[PDB]
Design a protein around this ligand. Structure first.
Ligand SMILES: [Fe+2]
Lengths: 662, 74, 149
């Protein structure tokens, strides 16, 4: 009969005017070989008509082989849709990968199938052959001991070619390096002879790499209400906990019974909130250009006013030690520069736990563990692979680029941040011990931190709304293929993927609440909701606020160049400016915060992946329901943000990227 | 200086002025610094916006720095 | 400072030094000026070569200014000359490595088909005009990794 074959090409690099591809239309009863001439163009697919004499039957596979190609020629085959003879629908064969080498690439039929016990099945033999090929290409590596494992790639050139950046992402990344280096060099020239002695000297570099919210931050960073606002709706909304008791590190000296009465009053009211930075205790600080940086492990106690705004009660910059059993308690009634420096020390320490624990570990490293285990244990026919492959896009490269340029020894993190030079690795090990499965789930994390039902917690409202939308998207896809709990237990590729994340990828995270196996649909549904939220929604909340809150460097210092204050009266402007980072560290903070938090011009919004891995109309109906519910949330957040002087923009689904890409 | 205008002091240049009307040391050195500081900031703004696209009102933010005030931000 | 090295003065920073070993005002202010003058010229060279393509030897002319001397201008003209390359072992920045060869080095392993060079090396060795610069101290030294490269 007549077969209409449409070949979609995402990207191509052809030296010649045309390239030849040998194609096999493999059916249930036979196969037919084809020869197609690729002449791809952007915006449309190439259509091919072929006449066969033998009856292929139901098409199951489409095989590809590049016929006599040059070595520099590359082809990114998106998908192959074959319209069979008659009134039957077109059969889709999604490739979405670079066709590598001269060997035969077999594309299975795009209907997602769970593996069965029939070893003679053609799809079962393909998915076992594919997982052997994936586990040789995708391999685990130990970047640092005690940390979750990464992809086996020292550089980005060592990566698998399907995990590489495409042309528009890579050229934008190369542009941002030049745009960042231009602005840092001009700021170096502009502030070369300038004297760094007052808070207004940061205006000399507060341009270019900044945002509209950062201008509002510069006006109001000394306000106690904005300092408290960042624990709920700032760049790091993940540390603030509702205090069920007074902390044992909060040791009040004699003569401070007014604070003790106020702390107990908010504790019985339930409005006492804490942000404990005790993970930074004993972390060795950086040495930047021979200048010693300094770290602290602060505790800030905050009270929730009835108007819905947090207010700070007491800042204890250092935890008790045997040398100093009662550290200095800093209050809003103190001399201004001493209280400003104490807020700056909390905010500097908020930068440390944001960038290392909640940004690097909790989103980038977790998603890479999800990314590598999805490739290693879920073949292309698996529905959970087709579910997760848009959500693991560019994750391995950006973590490889971070491990090469940012968090490497002597990297950009070592040149600006106080935890660099080895202390961030030690902080990452402590953060990995605290990396629980409940902490990555906002219904479990915000209940553990007691942030449920807070009207001013705009992250917590949007994260719970996003979790319900994503779990509905998860339950729509999972129940299409896992109708019963025994099907979830009877899926050996899913149980291997669950073990590859928890036991292998997250380095034996069974003691931290991560499941070693899936015993029900809901346990699978909760874990997959955690995977999508970490890759998309948790990353967006933790990354997109970097230019808004860190472009003004005194709002959250990347480092501190003086020891934490112990006497309030000795703190002067030279103490504050000597503690705040110098201009070279402050320019590097603005450049990195801009580069990480800018909107990628090639970004895929959440749920808006154009790649059609699924072929059934029912998974497309769930994905369209996902885009419908996010658009409903997009209107709800925008209507809320119009009535707020300090809007929370980072969890708008239009601004939420579909994976961890930057 | 020009016809139809109020008359000026007879001095083509500042060196042709009466010596009692000249700038003192602090005024003259501050005036020379401001010419250098003005030329520094303009040349860096020239480099920063050399290849930038000037097509929207937010592109003036690329040069709205340095020589500005608190009221100008408002 | 490092094990196996000659010992230093006990000072982690310059502020830990004895006060009589410190820089005076004119030395310290000149040192601070050179850091600013060095950072100015590097930042402008970073800007000037930000979009430049680094594909030919004449691209080094884009940064060959400022921090240079009269002899370095002559060096730029004549660095590909074999006589200037050989001149630096005697009168260059490092005149300390070149030794007169009393014998052929054991690391100098000539393959087959290079008997003309073997005749030339033995000719200069018996004449006493054979000189060597052996950089064998660099053998097995782990190389740097600069910005991941
Ligand atoms: Fe990120």
């Amino acid at each position: 009969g007549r077969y209409r074959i449409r070949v979609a090409t995402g990207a191509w690099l052809f030296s010649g005017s045309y390239n030849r591809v040998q194609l096999w239309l493999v059916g249930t009863r036979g196969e037919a070989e084809l020869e197609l001439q690729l002449r791809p163009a952007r915006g449309e697919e190439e259509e091919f008509d072929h006449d066969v004499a033998e009856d292929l039957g139901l098409l199951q596979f489409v095989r590809l082989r590049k016929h006599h190609w040059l070595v520099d020629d590359a082809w990114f085959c998106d998908r192959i849709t074959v319209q069979g003879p008659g009134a039957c629908a077109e059969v889709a064969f999604p490739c979405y990968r670079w066709v590598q080498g001269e060997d035969i690439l077999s594309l299975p039929e795009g209907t997602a199938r769970l593996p069965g016990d029939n070893a003679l099945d053609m799809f079962q033999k393909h998915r076992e052959k594919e997982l052997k090929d994936r586990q040789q290409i995708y391999c685990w590596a130990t970047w640092k001991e005690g940390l979750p494992l990464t992809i086996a790639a020292d550089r980005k050139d060592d990566l698998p070619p399907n995990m590489r950046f495409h042309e528009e992402k890579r050229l934008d990344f190369e542009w941002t390096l030049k745009a960042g280096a231009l602005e840092m060099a001009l700021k170096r020239v502009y502030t070369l002879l300038s004297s760094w002695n007052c808070l207004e000297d940061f205006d000399q570099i507060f341009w270019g790499q900044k945002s509209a919210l950062a201008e509002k931050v510069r006006q109001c960073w000394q306000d106690d209400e904005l300092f408290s606002y960042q624990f709920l709706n700032g760049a790091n909304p993940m540390l603030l906990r509702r205090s069920t008791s007074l902390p044992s590190r909060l040791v009040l000296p004699s003569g401070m019974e007014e604070l003790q009465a106020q702390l107990e009053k908010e504790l019985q009211n339930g409005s006492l909130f804490e942000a404990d930075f005790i993970l930074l205790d004993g972390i060795p600080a950086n040495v930047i250009r021979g200048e010693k940086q300094y770290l602290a492990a602060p505790l800030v106690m905050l009270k929730m006013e009835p108007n819905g705004k947090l207010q700070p009660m007491v800042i204890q910059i250092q935890p008790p030690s045997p040398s100093s059993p009662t550290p200095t308690l800093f209050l809003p009634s103190d001399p201004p520069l001493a209280w400003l420096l104490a807020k700056s020390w909390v905010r500097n320490s908020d930068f440390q736990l944001h960038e290392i624990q909640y940004h690097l570990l909790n989103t980038h490293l977790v998603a890479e563990v999800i990314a590598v285990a999805t490739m290693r244990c879920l073949p292309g026919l698996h529905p959970i692979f087709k579910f997760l492959i848009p959500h693991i896009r560019y994750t391995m490269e950006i973590n490889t680029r971070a491990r090469t340029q940012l968090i490497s020894d002597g990297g950009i993190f070592d040149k600006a941040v106080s935890t660099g030079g080895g202390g961030h690795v030690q902080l990452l090990r402590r953060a990995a011990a605290q990396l629980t499965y409940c902490s990555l789930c906002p219904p479990d994390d915000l209940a553990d931190r007691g942030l449920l039902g807070l009207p001013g917690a705009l992250y917590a409202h949007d994260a719970l709304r996003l979790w319900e939308i994503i779990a509905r998207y998860v339950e729509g896809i999972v129940h299409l293929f896992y109708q019963r709990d025994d099907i979830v237990k009877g899926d050996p590729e899913l149980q291997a993927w669950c073990r590859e994340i928890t036991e292998v990828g997250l380095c034996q995270a069974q003691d931290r609440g991560f499941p070693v196996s899936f015993q029900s649909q809901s346990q699978l549904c909760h874990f997959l909701t955690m995977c999508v939220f970490t890759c998309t929604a948790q990353h967006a909340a933790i990354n997109q606020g970097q230019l808004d809150w860190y472009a003004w460097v005194p709002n959250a210092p990347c480092t501190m160049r003086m020891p934490p204050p112990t006497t309030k009266e000795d703190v002067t402007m030279a103490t504050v400016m000597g503690s705040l980072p110098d201009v070279r560290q402050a320019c590097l903070q603005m450049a990195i915060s801009w580069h990480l938090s800018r909107r990628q011009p090639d970004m895929v919004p959440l749920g808006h992946h154009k790649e059609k891995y699924f072929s059934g109309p029912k998974p497309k109906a769930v994905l369209n329901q996902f885009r419908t519910d996010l658009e409903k949330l997009e209107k709800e957040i925008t209507a809320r943000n119009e009535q707020l002087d300090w809007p929370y923009e980072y969890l708008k689904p239009s601004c939420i990227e579909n994976s961890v890409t930057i």
